[PDB]
């Protein structure tokens, strides 16, 4: 993988292997959630920031500053097959002073077709008191070089599934799932709970039977507040219609918000 | 990745992924164990097998037989980092009418030095009744042709760590992890649970405080029953020891029926 002609992307190769498959012979949505973090983390070596899950450049580290995911919306079209090869395109964009912006292309090698794409919303925050001070006019200088100039959206539609506002789940849910911790391979080197971790979580609540009957096509989720190590998360879902539903995540005990989002899926 | 000159073995290089590190910087257990069964998969394909995770030929595919493992052991010396490119060699070798073994050889391919050796038992069985059953002649004369003549063992040492009966943890355990159950990312083509999430649930019920101050050197684990997709799953370990040991065990816990049990060596950094 390397920055393109221009260096205002990063394109990156992938073999799916034979433990990132699932149920359908194809590679599961965890699978593509990992892949996109990999190209964002190498995109991030390639052009001078931290290589952990922040992006943090000087100046941030200076002021204990860190970029943290506020949503992740995700669409994919054909999940790859086991030894497919798959290309992913990300760049980075400035979103004025609310954040940043990642967005990502998905293709087949072979057929050059477009497969899926992504788009991500970044805050900035303090690491120590996780407020979201998003105020810096020079730390905007130093990721500004690494942005194309021109808007470049993976979604660009006017109003579309991306920029939607996701409504809170009314209790009872229709389904769910219980007790849901991390384990060791879901931490990363600050013993921080994986953000693809949340997505699959998410979709622990789906049923056996809408799995084996469809496939995940769009799924926004909103990040509230961080799952800790020692935490554990509760699972919601309902109904709210291709087949839609609403979710929740929550803290098994006070039943703490952390996540909340949408899915569509669609008949095979 | 590819067969070698003799294609009596299978040899494939890996770059270490950001997603697979842990806490140490380096690849954990879980990812180390991941890149063994890809290997072990291409190597497969590249003969002729089943690529569903049983290695199934002709003849038993015709009689509903399956390769399962029941012991898994790995030793870990250097646990490549974020970006390192790692080679694995993996083969496969006839223990008679008993079943298959497997093993494999990690290797920095920068400094060309071993940072790792495994070793698998395997037993054909009844893919449905799941009664194992000795290797028939039909059988055995089908994948042969693809295992090397001579022995060649990652641990050939006289009586090595790989073939050592493990003992059943007596209650109560030091250290426990209760109501683990799998996810859809841990789930194959026919949704049984994969090989290398009982590892990391073995590992479950170390402190963290082990984790931190040393790291994962010998991991021996014996398979006695699968856990299936709504099965919930309890840790147990007790210390039975520079160096730390301990005894493990998984079972069920609306029954306490034994999947797993196993011993864990570490070493401090
Ligand atoms: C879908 C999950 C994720 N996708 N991407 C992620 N992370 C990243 O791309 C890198 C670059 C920004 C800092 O972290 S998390
Ligand atoms: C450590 C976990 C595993 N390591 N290896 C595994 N599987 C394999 O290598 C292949 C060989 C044919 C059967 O499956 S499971």
């Not at 002073?97 to 925050?125: C, F, H, N, Q, Y």
């Not at 554990?232 to 087949?243: A, P």
Request: net charge negative.
């Amino acid at each position: 993988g390397s920055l393109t002609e221009d260096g205002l992307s990063y394109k990156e190769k992938f073999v799916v292997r034979s433990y990132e498959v699932g149920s359908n012979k194809t590679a599961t949505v965890e699978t593509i959630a990992n892949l996109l973090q990999e190209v964002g983390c190498n995109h991030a070596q390639s052009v001078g920031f931290s290589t952990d899950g922040f992006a943090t450049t000087t100046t941030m580290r200076k002021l204990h500053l860190i970029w943290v995911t506020a949503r992740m919306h995700i669409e994919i079209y054909k999940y790859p097959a086991w030894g497919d090869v798959v290309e992913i395109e990300t760049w980075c964009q400035s979103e004025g002073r609310i954040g940043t912006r990642r967005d990502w292309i998905l293709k087949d090698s072979v057929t050059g077709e477009v497969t899926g794409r992504a788009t991500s919303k970044w805050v900035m925050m303090n690491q120590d008191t996780r407020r979201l001070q998003k105020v810096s006019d020079d730390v905007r200088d130093e990721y500004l070089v690494f942005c194309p100039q021109e808007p470049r959206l993976a979604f660009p539609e006017e109003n579309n599934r991306s920029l939607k506002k996701i409504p809170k789940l009314e209790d009872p849910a229709q389904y769910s799932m219980i007790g849901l911790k991390p384990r060791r391979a879901d931490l990363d080197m600050n013993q921080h709970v994986n953000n693809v971790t949340y997505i699959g979580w998410v979709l622990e609540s789906i049923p056996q039977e809408i799995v084996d009957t469809h496939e995940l096509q769009v799924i926004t989720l909103d990040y509230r507040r961080e799952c800790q190590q020692d935490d554990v998360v509760d699972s919601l879902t309902t109904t709210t219609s291709d087949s839609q539903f609403l979710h929740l995540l929550r803290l098994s005990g006070d039943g703490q918000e952390i996540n909340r989002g949408t899915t569509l899926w669609r008949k095979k």
